[PDB]
Symmetry: D3
Subunit: 226 residues, 6 copies
Amino acid sequence: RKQRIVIKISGACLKQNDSSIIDFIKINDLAEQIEKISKKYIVSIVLGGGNIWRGSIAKELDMDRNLADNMGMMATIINGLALENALNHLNVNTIVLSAIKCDKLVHESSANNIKKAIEKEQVMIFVAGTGFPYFTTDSCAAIRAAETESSIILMGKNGVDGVYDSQFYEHITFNMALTQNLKVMDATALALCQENNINLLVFNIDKPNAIVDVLEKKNKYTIVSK
Amino acid sequence: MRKQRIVIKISGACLKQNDSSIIDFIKINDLAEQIEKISKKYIVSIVLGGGNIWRGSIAKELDMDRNLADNMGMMATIINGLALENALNHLNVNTIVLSAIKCDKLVHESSANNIKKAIEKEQVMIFVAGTGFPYFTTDSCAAIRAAETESSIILMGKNGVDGVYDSAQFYEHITFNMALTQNLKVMDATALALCQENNINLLVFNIDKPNAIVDVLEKKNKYTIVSK
Amino acid sequence: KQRIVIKISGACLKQNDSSIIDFIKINDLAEQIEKISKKYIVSIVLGGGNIWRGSIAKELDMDRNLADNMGMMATIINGLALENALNHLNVNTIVLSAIKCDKLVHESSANNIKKAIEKEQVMIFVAGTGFPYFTTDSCAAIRAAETESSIILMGKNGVDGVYDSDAQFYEHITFNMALTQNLKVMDATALALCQENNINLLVFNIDKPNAIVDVLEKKNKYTIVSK
Amino acid sequence: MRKQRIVIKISGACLKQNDSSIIDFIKINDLAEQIEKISKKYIVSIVLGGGNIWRGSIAKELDMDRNLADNMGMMATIINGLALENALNHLNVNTIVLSAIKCDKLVHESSANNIKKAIEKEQVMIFVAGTGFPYFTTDSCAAIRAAETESSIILMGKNGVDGVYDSDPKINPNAQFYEHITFNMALTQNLKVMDATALALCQENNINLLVFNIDKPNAIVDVLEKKNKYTIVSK
Amino acid sequence: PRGSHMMRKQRIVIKISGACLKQNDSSIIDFIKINDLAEQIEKISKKYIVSIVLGGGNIWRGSIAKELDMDRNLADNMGMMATIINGLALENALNHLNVNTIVLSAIKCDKLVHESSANNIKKAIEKEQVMIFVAGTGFPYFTTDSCAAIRAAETESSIILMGKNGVDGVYDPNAQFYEHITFNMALTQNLKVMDATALALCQENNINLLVFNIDKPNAIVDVLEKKNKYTIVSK
Amino acid sequence: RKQRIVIKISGACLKQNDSSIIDFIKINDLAEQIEKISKKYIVSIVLGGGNIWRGSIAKELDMDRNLADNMGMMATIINGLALENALNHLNVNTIVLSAIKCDKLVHESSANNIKKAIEKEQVMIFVAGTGFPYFTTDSCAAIRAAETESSIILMGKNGVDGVYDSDFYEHITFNMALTQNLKVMDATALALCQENNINLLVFNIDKPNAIVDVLEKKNKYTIVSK
């Protein structure tokens, strides 16, 4: 009866200040929530690398997009190993699955390994995106959702309670989103979610117990469905 | 001389004549002949489908979940990729098969480095096994490869159809916005989004016709441009 | 628990040219393997004739190194299809490939075979030896010796066993009489491999319903090849 | 030319200006410009640290065991390695990233063959991910890479300090500055120019140190021309 | 020593040089010697988490490298291959005694051996497998002793059993026996217990040595029970 | 393709006595011959490991066949790197191609890598057999000959001039060797050679300049064909 979910966790969720790329209280709070959630759900985590690497630094370094996205993928691996460590301390059975092969550090994602991880009911930490440039964290979240047969992506926003207009939305269609010219995710991720019937649960991730609370429908959130 | 970069999307059906053989030698050789000529003026990336070997309908019959079904399709593209490479080798075209899935005994792996290296050598790049991920179409892979190689245009070969219609009125030029508004199925929504985000144009034409790929680059027949 | 190799040619998985793999045929195969796996340690060696043949290689002017590579990718496709069919029957199974391709299959090795035997998984051997100039029969012989299987089930498509030529049915023949009589049970390489390592053949008609189960219970017409 | 072989140890701090960005483009481009000029006279091996991205203090905060902590550090050096390669490619320097950990989609693997091949081609070798093993420092890896490439000297760039002193200069306005010191004198005084393991590796294989201030403009080029204040550690 | 129990076992590294596996020149590996070793490891593995670090001297030595005009990078590579051969032989011997065992290699070679990594070591310890460490560090300029130190630190083993071929422990004919020496006392007395690098690594990570005669029957079992003549090296 | 040859070099060719697994004078003499030969031929070398590992030691160690053949494969890699070193000192362009992947030591054999090595006209040193148990050095020699499109295998014997009936045939047929019951190669290697029209050139390899001489038809040798 365990239903499957993808939690999109951007890099900003792991960082407090510029002094440290990863903040221990923020990542441990995250781990604590995942611990509780993993009792009722099969959990897939899709991480960003914005705390370590951003598009702005790529421009400063005159870095072409192929290489820039590669840097981002490495950043997600660092975050992935940090989250795994935090979850291991809580005795949560967890596995880091990477789109890029690097056996000394992480396991490789594949149809077999995902299936294997689901049977063991491991928390799946997905890293290095798709192993391809020109993908966003959101697009990877879409692909991972379809791949793991998760019908919903929890889309944590940093500061924002859900879909607004920079009036709140309790619920919104994908159609009504694109007619209203709202940038909930990039166009590619939107298309991916629509094609494979994946819903979004947009909420404020900065709030204490945010992820636990929105699965209990406790706070302000937006659902983006067909 | 001086070469601009193009992606040619070649579906599985372009390589197959009838059900007796998954790959037809005349069709693949004709394709290789055209690529030979084109590679003198362009840096050529080929993105192959596997429809001649593997289809979505067979996956249903075998009660095959999507993760596995798309993996079968990826292996199909590798077979096609090696066949095309062989045909191009016979014409002394410098060529390399770059795979999204690692398989050293058969193919080279696609990567930032290997693509860059193949471009410098001006090799025809045969891209194979899609993105290595399920839930992607050949069109989406074409978009990703175009962005990755900095190709501004994808030649979208259609089997039988001259371009973009509405069923029967012919368009010479349409916008991506104009496309999905008229509920036209040029590519899947994901591929469309990818092309728009990265300013990649489509050149839709009939690929079944003799010398079709060569002729559309010389603007000689009926075709449709899709831009922003 | 006795160890066996079942040689399954590509034609066993195909009905007609419209589809490379037929769901009824592969499901029937899986059903039989399911039952057999309760009494035997099962190794499956697959061909790729349903997808790729020697005749297409000639048409494409394809040299042998590449042609055999095409065939090996064909067996992987078949291997993943059969694994899927067996998974739906809750049979513990693993695809072991002679060619490394981690995103799709596991690699065959001394360790992984040993590990698969301990777990009593059905072993689906794929991509031959990873080398050109090998037949499916030769791979079956190597896999038999490697798994310490004393017998290869040699499924033929249409033929009840070994005859004079196709009519006298042989109940039992020797590999020595499988060249002396000018017959062609397997290629010479596979024959030598089997003799070298004391591997016997059980030649039977695999097209018949329940054929694999029946021959292990000695129920139908079959030929023993030994000595 | 008959190029002599050198290892340049570049810590993470050399690539970072402030906390807003892990890698600063001016600092890394300045480094690349110097390596460009140096590579005309020398076969250059670069050994990078990852302190701009990852440090030991973060590992403690995250309650991270040492095996995992050092793995984070190795991934950090790969990021730095790819950024430096990019900077050098823009200056048309033939360069290769050689990693102690296999990761084909991003880097080449270091091996006896690949090093030999890179030396013949006279590429700048950017060594990355240390030894692929925990319990090694950047210094230790620099020693190993020096021995492996048959480099007789390691340029040991320090951030702010001009070289080896008998004590911290920031405190004592009376600290001796050594233009040359032996490993022997340095250990009886208990100076820790490098960690004990790196020191032992250098002594075992007759590798010398050239300690200097890396923050100064043109520092690496100048020290090879013997132009500024530097400490040679030898014997 | 360490003297542990059946649950929550202490972790040890046993350094087994190539000479322990060879009787004479007619065969590189002697079945009696390797089976005796396996028998001891079987008994020891009941009370300890056991890591074995093997040398390759029975197959390859430094002297052959000189004869073949072989540079160090390649020479050490030959040695690493030798340890893999030894590793597979010991694993076979241990498998016949039904000891759960795994060969972990610093060099990737999937058809022969498993790769060592933080994850695989952790996984092997959980399963309480005997870990046979092979191919050193995958790098040249390391001795078997230095690999033993690195493996000890990596596995969090507090002690390395240093089997010597012929000698009961540490001495200065009729020499004086040391029951205990410091690492300081080790170098300061010119006593070559291990190479300088291995010594440094052990000091840095607080790893002790247990030096004993490995040629004697039941030697490894007996020194863990404190039964014979042996030397502790420690801080 | 025709002017390509396979030279089968057993382990015994590299060893003088038990004190050293590899003898420098024997291996250097072999290297000198290969140097001269590689000017006129595309050379594939198939090495055995009998100088380091043999079947008799496997029995003593109670070693199952799968593991025993694995030991032998690692032995050939050691020999392969030794021969490469000897050829490098003579400035011969050479590459070690292994049936088993081990990137830190050797390159992997494949259709692409063989093709690439042939175009470069490198001496190919084939190592680790087929990567499979139940193969002999002779069988590997057959497979490499067919793979490289070599029409002939130089079958160096240690002590014997050619094909007798033990202590002389100048030309034997394959079928004749079977009727006569001669042990030229194991049955599998014989079948492989016949299937792919590969000839054998059996000669005494212990003799000075033996390999060079037999290609110039200079000494006593047996030619095997069908």
